[PDB]
């Protein structure tokens, strides 16, 4: 069964919006 | 500045991304 | 099956996600 | 400004989300 990979590629991808949230916040604190 | 308000708004989306994987992954071991 | 009720979640963030881009963009411009 | 690349980043995530969901309901649909 693929859901498994499936569930960690959206894993990654929440990791990656998370860490753009991180950038936007820290490109309006400068 | 709004930026930091839309940069909470990417986080919250960003947590419930990762709970939907946690959740996909349940329901491939189940 | 919940799958397919997953899936539209999913499509829903995605959605959302989109809509803050297009907004963060705008911000940009103006 | 670096505003508008990062929303075209947040605009790439939105877009491999939406291609996953759309990759979940077909695994559901199998």
Aim: charged share 35%; hydrophobic share 55%; no cysteine.
């Amino acid at each position: 069964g693929e859901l498994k990979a499936l569930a960690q590629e959206l894993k990654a991808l929440a990791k990656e919006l998370k860490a753009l949230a991180w950038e936007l916040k820290a490109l309006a604190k400068g």
